[PDB]
Amino acid sequence: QTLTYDDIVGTGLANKCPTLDDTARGAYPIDSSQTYRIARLCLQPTTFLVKEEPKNKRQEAEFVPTKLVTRETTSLDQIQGELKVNSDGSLTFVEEDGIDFQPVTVQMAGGERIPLLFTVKNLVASTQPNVTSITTSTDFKGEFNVPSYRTANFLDPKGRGLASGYDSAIALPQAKEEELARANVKRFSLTKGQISLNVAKVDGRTGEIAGTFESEQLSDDDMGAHEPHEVKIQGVFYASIEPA
Amino acid sequence: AELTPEVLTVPLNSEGKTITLTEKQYLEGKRLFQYACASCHVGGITKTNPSLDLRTETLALATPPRDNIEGLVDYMKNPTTYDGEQEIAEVHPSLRSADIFPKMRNLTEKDLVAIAGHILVEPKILGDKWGGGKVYY
Amino acid sequence: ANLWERFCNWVTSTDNRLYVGWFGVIMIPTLLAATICFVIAFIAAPPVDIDGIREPVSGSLLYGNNIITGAVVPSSNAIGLHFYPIWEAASLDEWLYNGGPYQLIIFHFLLGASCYMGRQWELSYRLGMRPWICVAYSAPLASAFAVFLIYPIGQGSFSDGMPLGISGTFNFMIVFQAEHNILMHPFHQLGVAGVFGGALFCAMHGSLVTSSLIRETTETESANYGYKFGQEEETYNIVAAHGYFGRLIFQYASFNNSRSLHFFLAAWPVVGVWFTALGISTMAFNLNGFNFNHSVIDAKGNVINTWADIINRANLGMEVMHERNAHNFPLDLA
Amino acid sequence: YSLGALSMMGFIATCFVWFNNTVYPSEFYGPTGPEASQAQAMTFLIRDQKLGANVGSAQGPTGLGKYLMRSPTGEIIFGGETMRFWDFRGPWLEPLRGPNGLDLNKIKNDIQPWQERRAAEYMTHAPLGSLNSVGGVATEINSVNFVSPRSWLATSHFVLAFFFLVGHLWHAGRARAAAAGFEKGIDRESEPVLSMPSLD
Amino acid sequence: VRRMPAFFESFPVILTDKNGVVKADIPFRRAESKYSFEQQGVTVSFYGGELNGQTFTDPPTVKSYARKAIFGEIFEFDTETLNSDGIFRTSPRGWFTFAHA
Amino acid sequence: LFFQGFHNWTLNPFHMMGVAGVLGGALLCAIHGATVENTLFQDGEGASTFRAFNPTQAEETYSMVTANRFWSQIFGIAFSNKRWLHFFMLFVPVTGLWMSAIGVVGLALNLRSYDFISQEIRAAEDPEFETFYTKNLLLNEGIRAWMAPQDQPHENFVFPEEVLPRGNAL
Amino acid sequence: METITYVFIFACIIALFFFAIFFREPPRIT
Amino acid sequence: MEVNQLGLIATALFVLVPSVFLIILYVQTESQ
Amino acid sequence: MEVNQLGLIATALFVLVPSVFLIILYVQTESQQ
Amino acid sequence: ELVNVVDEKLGTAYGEKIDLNNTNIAAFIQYRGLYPTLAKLIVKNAPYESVEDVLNIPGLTERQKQILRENLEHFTVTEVETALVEGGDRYNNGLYK
Ligand code: CLA
Ligand code: CLA
Ligand SMILES: CC(C)=CCC/C(C)=C/CC/C(C)=C/CC/C(C)=C/CC/C(C)=C/CC/C(C)=C/CC/C(C)=C/CC/C(C)=C/CC/C(C)=C/CC1=CC(=O)C(C)=C(C)C1=O
Ligand SMILES: CCCCCCCCCCCCCCCC(=O)OC[C@H](CO[C@@H]1O[C@H](CS(=O)(=O)O)[C@@H](O)[C@H](O)[C@H]1O)OC(=O)CCCCCCCCCCCCCCC
Ligand code: HEC
Ligand code: OEX
Ligand SMILES: [Cl-]
Ligand SMILES: [Cl-]
Ligand SMILES: [Fe+2]
């Protein structure tokens, strides 16, 4: 219902997206002469999976489950952007703004910790063509940017960084700089991710939708110092569409 | 070194007229600056927006310019943004906004010049320290 | 008689090798929990994100530390002052990450050490003694509450409590100097006089009693066998020590009452240490050390630096480097 | 007993005046330490937003939001070191709070000038300062003569509370010793320990 | 290059002119830097020893000879034979003095 | 503070022995004064107990036997020999200052215990390896660069703003 | 190997505590 | 961790040798 | 030579520990008479 | 193969002039009348091909177009550097006093 901050605080519910009834399986019509926007988009991860490093013999690497260790701090919400109607009839969402990143650390068997910037920054998600109405079989597929996990000012434990910091290993004054370059030289990565959103609950009266999502993106590489992992994120999402 | 009239001579207006000050007025305007302004402007910086300081060079490139007494006294009545396009007395203390910034209610016109001359004098004394921040403490 | 009383008599028994007592009933299990968690974490705890910025600090021997660099690491700033028992975590893995062992250890320890204090009273009552030893111990106890409890409260986070480590302790001291100028605080000056003066009077009292030992042995045996335990008489001539020390200085700077002399030895370091713990506890609320930066100026207004200004340059270098990735805005207000 | 009671109460008083801005209004007593630390983040969200920053999507250096992040139960809270202080509640700030914490739409649209003023006033009056009443951090230059009443009252009442707890232990133990009849020392003729079996 | 004093485990790279006016450095914060080698186009030419007559002009190379110029004259070292770790040690003059004092 | 930022004097075993000798002296000072004061024999009928001691008396003014038992049972050990106990009091602090004096003679030569090599070799290769050891070194670097120009005027250190080391914001 | 050495020495000290308390020279009263 | 490998033998003898000295002297006191 | 580094700790302990044992028992044998 | 991209940028025109595509918004204080009003506009519309495309920003008053003309000699443009513009760093680059 109309709960309040003081109802919610400390419960873990601030990290949950809203939901629609078992019975909201209707459909929202798209008046192509019209303009639209996602007034709020919320993504809530429920599982993080990391691809394992198959040995030189390999055969195949699988996505293994991982333990979340950073608590109910993982959700993306208050995301806004405009829902265009294209000419083949498809719908395309274009993010503007929103809390569209969360840093997250999960932990693999054996104890390896894997940070990642769970994000949909600059998302661009489209429907199949000729969608006159949004329904409980509508899908968007999209891509986003994943900037470096740390940004340019971040200094390492020996004081080294990109936009700031030592440019060398000062505790070893006369070592050979050559084998240290990958840690002396901070690099700022920007990669692309992918996300599918499967609408499964629609409430045409209010303009709300709800469904599942699954994304794949890279984990932190620590400004160039090691190789990233592939990560697969699944969860649920909630959206509100308003006439623009 | 000592506090002299050549030190205490600061631009009065942008017409290059000047005015010379007393020991009494510089010290008078130090006290009032402490009372009314330094909570934010200690040593020539601005705590709530460190990008703007009171270095006379910064004051020079303000629209209107503020590296003189009249410009400063005006800013203390009707403050604007650096570029002149916005009045900001709703958030910056001023005589205009002395109903929300009480410490201004009892400032006389002789007081606002005391403060302005202090501001314009102080960097002749301290140089880089004034407006510099912790690097120069 | 009945069960509850046979047990009550065992608890308060003065014949147990180690006194238990009612304070001992709370003390034992809590020290045991603190000690066991601490030994396991020091050795094996994985890295701990102390400042809430997902930048874990390794404190344990198996993760690359030695005795001097290791520590049990304070819980995360993201927790601040919230209670974080194991049961509040979704997994031991989360708990370890966010620094839970630190909270478990310091509460069981603070509790068990406060009952240590009461135990000192309790056994003195069963033994017919005067009761105030526990008062002396309150000076170290109070100092421990300061760095582990009071200072986190005032600053809003157990992430700023003292780490459980040799190097971590230095880390805490240096950041304290930059943020409070503790060296310029009178209560810590009272603490140094506390412990310099204690060690002084320690070396003095020993040196002067050892100087006045009564020949009871030959040159081939330890002097120590000139004393036998529970002997009725004294083993040194205090009149002789007064005569020596009364002349080292002058006659009335010298104690000749044994009772006055020992109460002096108790009171000096206890009070001083009370003051330095009071000083950590009031700098918990940002009532900081004297500030004479740019306090001396010349006729014109130039700053004439003093030694206080040099101290501030040191303080400033600690200020700007500490927790280097943790500040987004220009003041470090806690 | 009363020394014990009063000790407990000075400690509570200490914590009342440091954290509580209801019966200790900040209009009268200056901001609380959390209040000042929170007000600093608000200040620089406002300014940067005025310049054009999208404060909800600004990744800071660590990967955490420069301006906004989640607490450990998910609530949206101010970023930076003030994350420890998200429990703060004050009339100048509660307006911008929705069900899941701070509302980004209200941040974008509803920040009144009186809040910009309160927030700046409070961050420049944070309860930090020196014993000779130079106000600010320890590295601050002389100029501003200020130590918050919250510091003066909480420090002074901790000191008092602590020394009254020491009072308790002194007089409680003496009162037991005296009622047993050995407050003046051990009776040489009846030294209890002598009637005790050895520990080994 | 201003030379490292004995007190300092570490020392910044600061280049002055014959008078001492700072003219180039390697900055920590890059954002408002005004003296970087890139900005000043500083170069290293060598005279004597292995490098005699050589000149380097790209900043990364000029930067690493700049970090050794704080130590004085620049020598080729063999660090593989002894598995040297790159951290300075004292001489027997030092070890004798310490032992006897 | 100079000794922290240039010599890393806190990390030095000889200062650690001195620190243990001073705080240990203060400990023995306090705990022996309180034990004597709280095992005294009743030798007058007044509440001020000080007036019940004559410097010329033969008798011990407090009970070594009962003190011993208290501490055996509180702490597990106690002193039993009054000569050993007072010699140990001369010993502990006196030996502490001597050990600290040795470390300073090393610092006369800049023979510091400034680093742990193994930590530096790892930290240099592994940018996620952080310990309290490395945090403290960053603080030292700050102390050195911020205080030296003014601490050592005769050197004419000029550090442009842009070479001064600083974390974010501060 | 270094961790093992630190822990072994620590372990020996705990053992020494045990004997020093429970197997002390028992003090007696001549 | 790339530690000094004579550290083990140095710690070991630093413990062993003076400890053997004390044990030798305690046991031969107890048997007279 | 590229030799086993525990060889040294091994030899030292192999020698020291049985030796100290024999010495400890010898010296307390002499302290009896 | 591995270079600090920010250090490379200081050898470009970013190191001499206000880079309309990269420089932090506080650098516009250096010159009269740009800050804050036009700084916001320059940055909000940032990515430009040539320095003079900045006169085509929608809404400029005629005094605004003239101020910019006066300060075109103090501008340059280079390629957008990802590390310089992400994190909202153009609005706040972590530098205060
Ligand atoms: C010569 C220089 C010097 C000297 C003499 C001192 C002296 C002191 N300083 Mg200062 N300090 C200095 C320089 C100096 N400092 C510098 C340069 C800085 C700035 C970097 C600081 C920063 C600083 C801080 C920040 C703090 C000190 C504190 C102290 C005090 C520490 C002792 C203490 O708390 O005992 C008190 C006793 C204890 C702490 C012990 C508690 C014992 C518990 C109850 C039992 C533990 C038992 C154990 C776990 C198990 C043992 C069992 C075993 C037998 C098996 C003392 C008065 C501290 C202080 O005042 O604390 C209140 C403090 O917090 N100093
Ligand atoms: C030198 C000694 C000293 C001094 C000057 C102070 C000074 C102060 N103390 Mg402290 N205090 C001290 C020692 C001291 N304290 C000691 C030793 C302790 C024990 C550890 C405490 C514990 C303590 C507590 C627990 C608290 C204070 C507080 C305070 C402040 C408010 C006092 C007050 O109003 O009391 C109250 C006054 C009385 C009890 C007298 C009764 C008055 C009647 C009931 C009032 C009725 C009023 C009513 C509205 C009128 C209605 C009229 C009509 C409409 C019907 C004040 C600045 C308060 C504070 O600010 O803490 C931060 C507080 O809460 N004190
Ligand atoms: C691997 C893992 C798990 C480890 C955990 C890591 C951890 C952090 C451990 C690291 C520990 C570490 C390295 C230790 C450092 C210690 C270090 C600095 C060593 C100092 C060495 C030393 C040689 C220094 C030189 C100076 C020196 C001699 C100091 C000695 C100090 C000393 C022992 C003082 C005595 C302390 C004390 C508790 C005494 C109790 C006395 C007592 C029983 C009094 C009782 C008593 C009183 C009376 O009055 C009467 C009358 C009677 C009758 C009576 O009984
Ligand atoms: C104008 C400003 C306002 C004025 C303010 C005044 C404040 C002053 C308070 C006066 C305090 C009263 C004296 C103390 C009580 C007393 O005398 O103790 C009891 C005994 C009695 O003396 C003994 O007296 C005995 C007789 S009797 O017991 O007094 O009756 C006698 O037998 C014996 O020989 C003799 O030594 O005193 C001592 O034994 C002598 C040494 C006293 C040392 C002072 C006590 C506390 C020291 C702590 C210092 C902390 C320093 C911190 C370091 C970091
Ligand atoms: C904090 C609440 C402040 C107080 C108190 C005072 N000023 Fe201020 N000042 C503040 C800000 C945030 C700004 C920037 C305004 C903007 O353009 O956004 C300023 C600016 C000034 C200036 C302009 C300086 C320049 O570089 O152009 C001046 C001359 C100035 N302030 C003076 C001043 C005086 C004299 C005050 C006391 C009477 C005073 N300010 C109070 C914040 C705050
Ligand atoms: O965490 Mn630990 O340290 Ca007390 O200030 Mn703010 O916070 Mn952080 O900074 Mn400086
Ligand atoms: Cl730090
Ligand atoms: Cl911050
Ligand atoms: Fe004694």
Domain A22-150+187-244 sits in CATH at 2.40.160.30
Can you give the CATH number for the domain in which J1 is found?
A: 1.10.150.320
The answer to whether the CB of C244 falls within 8 A of the CB of C208 is yes
Which contacts of C31-38 are long-range, i.e. CB under 8 A and separated by 24 or more positions? C31/C108, C31/C109, C31/C112, C31/C113, C31/C116, C33/C104, C33/C108, C34/C104, C34/C105, C34/C106, C34/C108, C34/C109, C34/C112, C37/C101, C37/C104, C37/C105, C37/C108, C38/C72, C38/C101, C38/C105, C38/C164
Question: Which are the contacts of C212, defined by CB distance < 8 A and separation ≥ 6?
Answer: C236, C237, C238, C240, C241, C244
Question: Which are the contacts of F105, defined by CB distance < 8 A and separation ≥ 6?
Answer: E98, E101
Q: Which residues of C101-119 are buried (b: 16+ CB within 10 A; e: fewer)?
A: bbbbbbbbbbbbbbbbbbb
Q: How far is CA F25 from CA A43, C134, C204, E92, F88, in A?
A: 62, 19, 10, 37, 9
Report chain A residues whose CB lies below 8 A from the CB of F138.
Answer: 157-159
What is the SS3 assignment for A198? Answer: strand
Question: Which are the contacts of B15, defined by CB distance < 8 A and separation ≥ 6?
Answer: none
- Flag whether residue E23 sits within 8 Å of chain F, measured between CB atoms: no
CA-nearest residue, atom 41 of ligand 5: B37
Pick D141's closest partner by Cβ from C289, C293, C315.
C293
The answer to whether the CB of E55 falls within 8 A of the CB of E46 is yes
Task: Record the tokens describing residue J90, joined without a space.
Answer: 């153009």
Paired strand residues for B19: B10
The answer to whether residue J91 is domain-embedded is no
Q: How far is CA J68 from CA A70, B37, B83, D59, in A?
A: 48, 34, 13, 31
Phi, psi (deg, nearest 5) at residue D96:
-90, 10
Question: Which are the contacts of J42, defined by CB distance < 8 A and separation ≥ 6?
Answer: J20, J28, J34, J54, J57
Nearest CA among A68, A1, A17, A2 for reference residue A211: A17
Nearest ligand 4 atom to alpha carbon C272: 54
Question: Which are the contacts of F112, defined by CB distance < 8 A and separation ≥ 6?
Answer: F7, F8, F9, F12, F106
- Rounded to the nearest whole angstrom, what is the distance from the C-alpha of residue C266 to the centroid of ligand 4? 13
The answer to whether residue J40 is domain-embedded is yes
The answer to whether the CB of A144 falls within 8 A of the CB of A218 is no
Strand J18-19 and strand J75-76: the pairing is parallel
Query: How many Cβ atoms are within 10 Å of D176's Cβ, its own excluded?
Result: 16
Q: How far is F26 from F48, CA to CA, in rounded Å?
A: 26
Chain F residue with minimal CA distance to E5?
F155
Signed CA dihedral, H26, H28, H31, H32: sign only: negative
Under an 8 A CB cutoff, do E67 and A168 touch?
A: yes
Residue that has been written with the tokens 């001489």 in this structure = E91
Name the J residues in 52-91 with CB < 8 Å from any A CB.
82-84, 86-87, 89
Report chain F residues whose CB lies below 8 A from the CB of G30.
Answer: none
The answer to whether the CB of C241 falls within 8 A of the CB of C206 is no
For ligand 3, mutation pick of F11, F15, F32, F38 (most atoms within 8 Å of CB): F32
Signed CA dihedral, C102, C103, C107, C110: sign only: positive
Cα Rg, chain C, nearest whole Å: 25
Strand A36-51 and strand A230-243: the pairing is antiparallel
DSSP secondary structure string for all residues of A96-163: EEEE-EEEEEEE-TTS-EEEEEEE-EEEEEEPPS--SEE-TT-EEEEEEEEE-SS-TT---TTSB-SS
Please report, as a single letter, which amino acid is at residue B105: R
Q: How far is B37 from J83, CA to CA, in rounded Å?
A: 38
Which of J82, J85, J91 is best to mutate for the A interface (most A CBs within 10 A)?
J82
**In Å, how far from its chain's centre is CA J45?**
10
Q: How far is E31 from A163, CA to CA, in rounded Å?
A: 7
CA-nearest residue, atom 5 of ligand 1: C192
- Flag whether residue H1 sits within 8 Å of chain F, measured between CB atoms: yes
Q: How far is E61 from E53, CA to CA, in rounded Å?
A: 16
Question: Which are the contacts of C69, defined by CB distance < 8 A and separation ≥ 6?
Answer: C165, C166, C167, F116, F119, F131, F132, F133
Boundaries of every domain in chain C: 1-334
- E-only strand ranges, chain B: 9-11, 18-20
Under an 8 A CB cutoff, do E31 and J93 touch?
A: yes
Q: 3-state DSSP: chain B helix, strand, coil percent, rounded to 5?
A: 40, 5, 55
**In Å, how far from its chain's centre is CA D65?**
25
The answer to whether residue J95 is domain-embedded is no
Domains A22-150+187-244 and A151-186 share a fold: no
DSSP state of F7: I
The answer to whether residue J1 is domain-embedded is yes
Residue that has been written with the tokens 């230095």 in this structure = C170
Q: How far is E79 from B128, CA to CA, in rounded Å?
A: 46
Nearest CA among F20, F29, F10, F4 for reference residue F99: F20
Question: Which are the contacts of F137, defined by CB distance < 8 A and separation ≥ 6?
Answer: A171, F8, F115
Report chain A residues whose CB lies below 8 A from the CB of F125.
Answer: 180, 183
The answer to whether residue B137 is domain-embedded is no
Phi, psi (deg, nearest 5) at residue C193:
-45, -35
Q: How far is CA J18 from CA J8, J75, J77, J81, in A?
A: 16, 5, 8, 14
The answer to whether residue B135 is domain-embedded is no
- Rounded to the nearest whole angstrom, what is the distance from the C-alpha of residue D28 to the centroid of ligand 5? 24
Q: Which residues of C134-146 are buried (b: 16+ CB within 10 A; e: fewer)?
A: bbbbbbbbbbbbb
- Which ligand has its closest atom nearest to the C-alpha of C152? 6
Question: Which are the contacts of F26, defined by CB distance < 8 A and separation ≥ 6?
Answer: C194, C195, C197, C198, C199, C202, C269, C273
C264 Cβ closer than 6 Å to some ligand 4 atom: yes
Task: Record the tokens describing residue F39, joined without a space.
Answer: 């095992």
Which of E32, E38, E57, E62 is best to mutate for the J interface (most J CBs within 10 A)?
E38
- Flag whether residue C285 sits within 8 Å of chain D, measured between CB atoms: yes
Q: Which domain holds residue B125?
A: 2-130
Paired strand residues for A213: A197, A235
Q: How far apart are the CA of J32 and the nearest CA of chain D, in angstroms? A: 17
- Flag whether residue C228 sits within 8 Å of chain G, measured between CB atoms: yes
The answer to whether residue J94 is domain-embedded is no
The answer to whether residue J28 is domain-embedded is yes
Q: Which helix (H) or strand (E) holds E100?
A: helix E92-100
Q: How far is C116 from F74, CA to CA, in rounded Å?
A: 9
Q: Which helix (H) or strand (E) holds D138?
A: none
Question: Which are the contacts of C225, defined by CB distance < 8 A and separation ≥ 6?
Answer: C216, C217
- Flag whether residue C61 sits within 8 Å of chain G, measured between CB atoms: yes
Q: How far apart are the CA of G27 and the nearest CA of chain H, in angstroms? A: 17
DSSP state of C72: E
**Do chains A and D have 3 or more beta-carbon pairs under 8 angstroms?**
yes
Task: Record the tokens describing residue C125, joined without a space.
Answer: 């009552």
Nearest CA among C112, C121, C111 for reference residue C27: C112
The answer to whether the CB of J44 falls within 8 A of the CB of J54 is no
The answer to whether residue B72 is domain-embedded is yes
Q: Which helix (H) or strand (E) holds J49?
A: none
The answer to whether the CB of J81 falls within 8 A of the CB of J23 is no
Domain A151-186 sits in CATH at 3.30.2050.10
Largest CA distance in chain G: 50
Signed CA dihedral, D75, D87, A2, D58: sign only: negative
Query: How many Cβ atoms are within 10 Å of A4's Cβ, its own excluded?
Result: 10
DSSP secondary structure string for all residues of C49-70: -TTSSS-PBP-SGGGT--TTT-
Q: How far is E39 from E56, CA to CA, in rounded Å?
A: 16
Q: Which helix (H) or strand (E) holds D108?
A: helix D104-109
- Flag whether residue E33 sits within 8 Å of chain J, measured between CB atoms: yes
Can you give the CATH number for the domain in which B117 is found?
A: 1.10.760.10
Question: Side-chain half-sphere of D100: how many Cα atoms within 13 Å?
Answer: 23
Report chain A residues whose CB lies below 8 A from the CB of D104.
Answer: 78, 98-99
D:F CB pairs within 8 Å: 39
Which contacts of A7-11 are long-range, i.e. CB under 8 A and separated by 24 or more positions? A7/D99, A8/D75, A8/D99, A8/D100, A9/D73, A9/D75, A10/D73, A11/D73
The answer to whether residue J96 is domain-embedded is no
Q: Which domain holds residue J25?
A: 1-86
DSSP secondary structure string for all residues of B35-55: HHTHHHHGGG--TT-TT----
- Flag whether residue E28 sits within 8 Å of chain J, measured between CB atoms: no
Which of A9, A11, A47, A69 is best to mutate for the C interface (most C CBs within 10 A)?
A69
Phi, psi (deg, nearest 5) at residue D13:
-55, -45
Show the DSSP H helices in F9-126 as ranges.
13-37, 64-75, 82-108, 117-125
Nearest CA among C74, C77, C98 for reference residue C86: C98
Task: Record the tokens describing residue H8, joined without a space.
Answer: 């083990």
DSSP secondary structure string for all residues of C152-199: HHHHT-GGGSPPEEHHHHHHHHHHHHHHH-GGG-HHHHHHHHHHHHHH
Q: Does the annotation list F15 as a binding residue?
A: yes
Q: Please give the tally of structural domains in chain B.
A: 1
DSSP state of A166: B
The answer to whether the CB of C49 falls within 8 A of the CB of C55 is yes
Number of helices (H) and strands (E) in chain I: give both, helices first.
Answer: 1, 0
Query: How many Cβ atoms are within 10 Å of C15's Cβ, its own excluded?
Result: 11
Please report, as a single letter, which amino acid is at residue F22: V
The answer to whether residue B103 is domain-embedded is yes
Q: How far is CA H15 from CA B120, E6, H8, in A?
A: 71, 36, 11
